[model samples]
Target: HWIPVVAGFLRKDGKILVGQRPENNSLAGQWEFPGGKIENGETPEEALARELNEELGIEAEVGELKLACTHSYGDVGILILFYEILYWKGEPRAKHHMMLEWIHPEELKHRNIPEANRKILHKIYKALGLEW
Candidate 1:
């Protein structure tokens, strides 16, 4: 099954927010854009807004779609949609992840982010005006 997922790229002060998956989580230790599965009957933006609140303890204003890609994990695959989050309320604490970090765009390429996330790095760099 292709599970629909939505992730947000929250930006502040020339940095973007990213989270480290808790050790108990599926993709433990890896960093990722904070988001989760899009529940049935929810729009992509709605899903991301909910996810950011639930996972990051922040009320995010989900912005434009940045990228969309799919990745397979043995038997199943996921269709993940990425979006920019230019505004939000709250301090954005790590509620569901091991840790939360605000990192420079260049740092994204150095992190142990997932392949699915890695696929969109070029797009992210271009969007943030880092490099191609």
Candidate 2:
């Protein structure tokens, strides 16, 4: 089955917003992009906006479509579409994660992101022009 998920790689000052998934979640304590599963009938952009508001409690100005990835975990799969959200109102409130942090692209790999999100790093590093 395909679960459509979306993530916002909020960027500013050469850093991206990432959250540490609480142990209760599927990915456990690993650091990953901020966003969530898309709701029924929601497009990728719509899901991005909704998830940002719910997770971070901010009205984000979702920018360009940064990347789209498909990854699997045994019998299930996820379609994760990532966006660049550079502008948002209010500070981000961590509603679901254990901690939220601003991380440089070069430092992302060491944070223990799962292989699926990890697969997107190539484009992210290249797009940011950071040596990987």
Candidate 3:
């Protein structure tokens, strides 16, 4: 089965927001965009806002769609919808992740990002008009 996930792309000063997965989570300590699964009956934007609040302790306004992709890992498939976060309130605190950081998009390629996210790195950079 495919799981619908929403990831928020928050940028400032050419850096993007990133979070490290909790050690107990599926991806362990790997870094990823801030987001979570879309619950039943929730729209993509709704799910994204809820996820950001829950995971980062911030109320965010979901903006335009940035990208979308799908990946499979043996038993499950992930359909990721990426959205630009136009605005937010409160500092982003890592309530769910192991930690958080605002990192440059180019720096992400040097990190242990999950394959699903890594595959879209160049596209993300292109979308932001940053050279890969």
Candidate 4:
């Protein structure tokens, strides 16, 4: 079984949340949609909200599932579920990342996103009819 993880994709007000992994993590210095591992006994939706609160000091309503995919790096792999955020309270602070920012979807392809996350962005780009 792969590592179970959850990501919150909050697209609101013409922007989406993106974050940079800290310089010491496995995919160091790369950007991703903010999220973390799914805890034991937690549903993906619950994990999404809990992780956002833990990492960003923000509360979010984890909404519809956007995409679910398994990705590997080395022998390590994770099954990640990306969910839409129905809404969020407060700005997402970068407590667990090197930085966090909101960006236009048009700029996603040019960002330094890791391979798996690039797949995620590709899905988003295709959904929005933006060229990858």
Candidate 5:
């Protein structure tokens, strides 16, 4: 079965939220947009909202669909769904895994982002109206 994933583009004050994978986790030290897999009956939006709340301890209003990327990694195939989100409520706290950072768009390239996520950096640049 394919793995379905969702990520939030939570931008504020010219920066976006990104999280570093816990040092003991599989993709340790890699940065990623905070989100998790979708369960059988959950819609993408519902899954996204749930993931953000669970991982970041904040509630957000999901916005326009941004980009969709699919890739295969060994025996698992991934469908990475991204969205433009803003207007969140409450402070963002890292409830799970490692530390979170608010990074400038230009700084993304320097981080050890997940391979699948690295593939979409250009798209995020474009979404933020930046020249790659």
Candidate 6:
């Protein structure tokens, strides 16, 4: 079996939205794009749109698939799919997380982001034309 996943890069004011996992959660206090597992029969784009609406309380126009990577932790492995999204219908109000931060690409290194997310961040920098 495969563990499918999806995430988004919501850009605003030259920053991106990131959320911190609750201290009690598995990756406690680690930052990550607001997303979750893809449901049965749902495409990656569909899952991203659904997760964005559910987690961030916004309607995002999911854009192109930017990266695909895989990582494993203990017993399970994840197939992570990331997208670059810019157009959204509403403000991202945090509804189901510990906290949210809109941070610049350079500032991401300071945050305790998940390991899987580090790869995503690299892709994000390239997508934003910030790679050097």
C-alpha local distance difference test of each model: 0.87, 0.83, 0.90, 0.81, 0.85, 0.82
Model 3 lDDT per residue over 49-113, tens place: 99999999999999999899999989999999989997999889989998899987889879888
Q: Residues 6-122, candidate 6, lDDT per residue (tens digit)?
A: 988888778888898776847687888888889999988889999999988888889988878887887788888888887888888878678988898688877888787675667
Evaluated at residue 94, the lDDT of candidate 2 is: 90
What TM-score number comes out for model 1?
Answer: 0.93
- Candidate 6, residue 106: Cα displacement in angstroms equals 0.7
Best by TM-score: 3
Best by lDDT: 3
lDDT of 4 by residue, 4-47 (tens): 88887776677778888887946687888888998889888888
Cα shift from native, residue 105, model 4 (Å): 1.2
Error of 4 at 36 (Å): 0.6
Each candidate: RMSD: 1.3, 1.5, 1.1, 2.0, 1.2, 1.6
State the weakest 10-residue window (summed lDDT) of model 3: 123-132
Cand. 1 Cα-lDDT: 0.87
Residue 20 deviation, candidate 1, in Å? 0.3
> Candidate 1, clashing residue pairs?
none
Q: How far off is model 4, as Cα RMSD?
A: 2.0
Locate the minimum summed-lDDT window of 10 residues in model 5.
20-29
Off by over 4 Å in 2: none
Write model 1 residue lDDT over 31-99, tens digit each, in one string.
998999999999999999999999988888988887888889989899988888888998899899989
**Model 3 ranges with Cα > 4 A deviation:** none
**lDDT, candidate 5, at 74:** 82
State every prediction's TM-score relative to the real structure.
0.93, 0.91, 0.95, 0.87, 0.94, 0.90
**lDDT of candidate 2 at residue 62, scale 0 to 100:** 81
Ranking by lDDT: 3, 1, 5, 2, 6, 4
In model 4, which runs have C-alpha deviations exceeding 4 angstroms? 126-132
TM-score of 4: 0.87
